[PDB]
Design a protein around this ligand. Structure first.
Ligand SMILES: N[C@H](C(=O)O)[C@@H](O)CNCC(=O)O
Ligand SMILES: N[C@H](C(=O)O)[C@@H](O)CNCC(=O)O
Ligand SMILES: [Fe+3]
Ligand SMILES: [Fe+3]
Ligand SMILES: [Fe+3]
Ligand SMILES: [Fe+3]
Ligand SMILES: [Fe+3]
Ligand SMILES: [Fe+3]
Ligand SMILES: [Fe+3]
Lengths: 167, 167, 167, 167
């Protein structure tokens, strides 16, 4: 299936406030898809950004295993507590307003927790001819981005997701 | 009808060439969706751009009936001649690379002729759950943009369309 | 070693309040060592007490795997989140005032988190000739109760521990 | 000295027998630590129990100098005779099964003669980190209960000692 839902019963309003407060202390980097690493490699010197990556030469997600300690008593830490799997290279992934991806396939699927979104933010699966929206409802959505797809955000606000790798 | 094609026997490469020449002496305006009016109101004093103004300034597309004189002797001239309907408020509409717009409805459907495009440029119809690609094949694609839709260009070049209105 | 410490940085005061409030809704059973099960077997009909056990005929801990759902947004749930292992048959184990055990050996060691205690509550290792006190400091203490031992509580208040099995 | 033994050639079984007979006509009082005074103050009107009163009522153990008359012709009589010191405030002190008392200090050290006991009955010295067992072997065990200590009986029977004070 392109998408599947895992109920976490996270409170989206408390989740949002927690993410917003974290970003004031650790701001997103890049443009287009702005990022913040939530997991770092052991003894990381740059724990908040090393995991962030855009370039075409993809790296391996295996070493990005440690959830930042300062998440431990935030509501955002509670999201990690309820996951049904061991996440890797978890990142905040925020699509800029009026921004979209090339039509392409990723090497690995990922789980998405939408923190902030709108009706203007969608995944477009080209061969499946399916348009998909991830609601900020506190639940976890597996999205098979190995399928030929793009994503776009036609809104004026950033579309903020938390994106988890697995294994 | 949601979309339809009218074979119309236009040479994509001549078109692209005439479009590119026209724009060197009449540049697109705006960011995101860049525009140029190909028709004006009778007696307009800004005929190349009045028709590009935002909707809140334009009562009716029907007022822009006059194809610029200096198109008479160009390949665009015969484009206008081949049309099976009468055109109004025709514009060049270019989507910037990595750009998309909100999910919305237009007042009237539109006829699209793609000048330059790529596999990363699509229309999305939200309630119909259809993804559409308009190829630069010299034919005329009707798009019922009254339906809830967005368009996006995930490529690195602008996606240049000529967009015709009608009754 | 008889004992070893794992820092959880749990706040003992918040831990205590949380345990006290839970016990008003789900009271301890038995006398001497009063108990409450914090993990139940899948689809348990008696989730709060089935795991509690005293009789000489010990049972296996393997099926008691599910932390009660209503712990999920208590501070007590945070204790389970920070554990460095998968606990089984976790119980609140409260020694009554003026109460002590026979001198004996258990089949398996356990981890102890002291919630409420005093200087009057000790483990006595008979062959090691060691007297040991588990402080209510928010950390986790492995105690090798396979060693010949007793425990006693000479205070006037209950000595409340959370006791985790492992694997 | 923390503990010492004085061989004293007393028959454990006769002792147990004389103790058990004495108690059928002079029962222990209290719960937890059950007691009977073997010595009284000269002219006491409650000679079997005045010496069992709590500390806040007893100025000095030295006042209870008189071994009850009716012990003269019993095996307990010769017990008193074998003593290498002069006894005062001698009592039978029995720990209830599964009972212990607080960790504390007594005013004066004491001489213990175990009548009935088990491997589940011990003294614990907290700062010295020693566990002591007093066997019912007919010998006299000095215990410096001025040291921070508790005692406990993890068995199913009472632990009966005879406890002698001295100067
Ligand atoms: N990791 C990127 C993303 O999910 O945002 C990648 O898969 C796609 N980048 C597409 C582009 O360069 O338009
Ligand atoms: N599970 C019991 C406990 O840890 O409390 C057991 O190991 C000992 N029971 C001793 C007794 O019956 O005194
Ligand atoms: Fe991608
Ligand atoms: Fe479809
Ligand atoms: Fe539109
Ligand atoms: Fe948590
Ligand atoms: Fe035990
Ligand atoms: Fe020792
Ligand atoms: Fe004492």
């Amino acid at each position: 299936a392109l998408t599947s839902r895992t109920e976490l019963d996270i409170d989206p309003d408390k989740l949002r406030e927690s993410v917003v407060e974290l970003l004031e202390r650790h701001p997103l980097v890049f443009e287009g898809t702005r990022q913040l690493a939530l997991q770092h490699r052991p003894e990381a010197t740059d724990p908040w950004y090393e995991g962030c990556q855009r370039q075409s030469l993809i790296s391996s997600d295996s070493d990005f295993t440690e959830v930042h300690g300062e998440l431990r008593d935030t509501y955002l830490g509670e999201v990690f507590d309820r996951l049904p799997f061991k996440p890797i290279r978890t990142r905040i992934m925020a699509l800029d307003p009026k921004y979209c991806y090339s039509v392409h396939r990723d090497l690995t699927p990922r789980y998405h927790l939408a923190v902030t979104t709108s009706e203007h933010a969608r995944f477009v699966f080209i061969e499946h001819d399916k348009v998909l929206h991830i609601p900020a409802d506190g639940d976890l959505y597996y999205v098979d981005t190995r399928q030929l797809h793009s994503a776009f955000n036609g809104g004026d606000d950033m579309r903020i997701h938390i994106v988890f790798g697995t294994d």
